Amino acid sequence: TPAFDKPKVELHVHLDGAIKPETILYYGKRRGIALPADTPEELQNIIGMDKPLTLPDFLAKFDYYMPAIAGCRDAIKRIAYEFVEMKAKDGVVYVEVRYSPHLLANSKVEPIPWNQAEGDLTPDEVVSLVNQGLQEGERDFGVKVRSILCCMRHQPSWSSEVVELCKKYREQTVVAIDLAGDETIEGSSLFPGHVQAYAEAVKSGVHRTVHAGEVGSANVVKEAVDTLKTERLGHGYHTLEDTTLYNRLRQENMHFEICPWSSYLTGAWKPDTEHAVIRFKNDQVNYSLNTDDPLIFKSTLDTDYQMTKKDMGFTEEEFKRLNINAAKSSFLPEDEKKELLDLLYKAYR
Ligand SMILES: CCCCCC[C@H]([C@H](C)O)n1cnc2c(N)ncnc21
Ligand SMILES: [Zn+2]
């Protein structure tokens, strides 16, 4: 039985980490692309994980299935559409899905990703394709959907395209910019290509979020907040190692996109310490619960709610509260943000 059987709001989930094994297998076979297994069940076992992995072991997971979807228009649009259906089964009423448009392209994209051969799908089209999938999905399944394009910490040369992409496709599902990738890459937060892109995001009113504090120190979080001027933090668990940064962030009602289950499987969180979210709760912090990558973590939104309910004493009043904050922190136009809030209020009370 669902841990929290009411409407939910999800702000931190990767499109390329939320694909149906079947769909991966389908395109794998239909377009001759080598694939570990050939049975959906076995496929999820190899792609899924249940024990922390090194960055490399983890990254490798993508080389596995990405070549199957990347470059194929049909597949890009489809996984987008199928992702909305997955969310509907979760009882999610609003969701912000993110992904790197360059990682699904095989044209333009400088270092062509996944040892993919030069193709015809550019990053710009990837975005428009995804927009349609997400849009038809919203129509058919009843879930409000917005998207966020990610910049990659190791490739600042893409960041400007990313912000221009968010600018060119706004309203049209794209509501913000993000920064994902290796946090340990020394100085990555300050790469001129990244800071300029977020600076442009500010000049153009493009909402900002950043993956910081998941593995890197509190300083990675600081740079995210003070230099990139982020409005939301992806994870941000290590913020707690700097009480003044933490106190200030609490002061400014900063939003933390928490991924409980995710943190446990990646090692970002060691089961010997009290999970960072438990203190966020005790501190009445502005945060939300997210799946991050259902595919790799073999989960569903419930997985995370089950985890905090069972192992962290999370009440219902808390679930409703954190979801209310998720709505309040959404990148939706105030206009539509109020409408989401009324939905949840009348549904929670
Ligand atoms: C090692 C990551 C390289 C390929 C990234 C694909 C994808 C994007 C950025 O949505 N992504 C999905 N989940 C991700 C995660 N937890 N951390 C970084 N990137 C992630
Ligand atoms: Zn993430």
Curated annotation (Swiss-Prot):
This is Adenosine deaminase. It is found in: Cell membrane; Cell junction; Cytoplasmic vesicle lumen; Cytoplasm. Belongs to the metallo-dependent hydrolases superfamily. Adenosine and AMP deaminases family. Expressed in gastrointestinal tissues (at protein level). The keyword Hydrolase applies. It comes from Bos taurus (Bovine). One of its GO terms (cellular component) is external side of plasma membrane. Binds 1 zinc ion per subunit. It is an enzyme of class 3 (hydrolase). It holds the Pfam family A_deaminase. Its cofactor is Zn(2+). Its main location: membrane. It catalyses: adenosine + H2O + H(+) = inosine + NH4(+); 2'-deoxyadenosine + H2O + H(+) = 2'-deoxyinosine + NH4(+); cordycepin + H2O + H(+) = 3'-deoxyinosine + NH4(+).
